[PDB]
Amino acid sequence: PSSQVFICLGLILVQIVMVSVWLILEAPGTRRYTLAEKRETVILKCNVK
Amino acid sequence: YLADEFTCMDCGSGQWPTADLTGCYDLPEDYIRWEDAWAIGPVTIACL
Ligand SMILES: CC(C)CCC[C@@H](C)[C@H]1CC[C@H]2[C@@H]3CC=C4C[C@@H](O)CC[C@]4(C)[C@H]3CC[C@]12C
Numbered sequence: 001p002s003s004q005v006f007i008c009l010g011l012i013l014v015q016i017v018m019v020s021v022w023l024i025l026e027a028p029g030t031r032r033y034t035l036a037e038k039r040e041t042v043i044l045k046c047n048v049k
Numbered sequence: 050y051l052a053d054e055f056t057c058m059d060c061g062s063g064q065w066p067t068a069d070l071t072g073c074y075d076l077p078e079d080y081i082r083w084e085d086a087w088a089i090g091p092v093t094i095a096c097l
């Protein structure tokens with residue numbers, strides 16, 4: 001009843017902190033990605049590469 | 050894009066010269082869309 005939930009929640013919280021610090025460091029946004037090999041096209045991309 | 054008659058310039062990666070070569074306009078943006086594309090299969094898969 002307790003130890004499994006505690007361990008799983010601990011791992012989930014560790015991952016949540018490790019990703020929240022990354023989102024804090026790198027502000028989210030949208031980028032107009034373009035390719036010189038193709039051009040004439042603009043891709044609205046999530047700021048994560 | 051010909052900024053002047055004698056000298057030709059560029060609008061940058063984001064912008065493109067117009068058909069009349071008189072100004073720089075933002076290029077259309079592309080993304081995954083539900084309107085008759087490869088997303089119908091993934092949508093049905095997610096629903097199932
Ligand atoms: C959705 C997430 C983020 C939070 C909720 C999940 C946790 C807190 C929930 C989900 C399932 C729940 C358990 C379901 C069944 C039992 C067995 C019972 O004899 C005592 C309570 C206990 C042990 C519950 C405790 C709380 C519990 C562990």
Ligand SMILES: CC(C)CCC[C@@H](C)[C@H]1CC[C@H]2[C@@H]3CC=C4C[C@@H](O)CC[C@]4(C)[C@H]3CC[C@]12C
Pocket residue numbers: 020023024027028
């Ligand atoms: C008490 C709990 C259950 C509240 C909900 C927790 C989650 C959903 C919340 C708590 C704090 C939140 C973060 C707070 C601030 C930022 C910076 C922003 O630039 C991107 C989103 C981001 C990274 C949020 C993501 C969602 C977040 C992690």
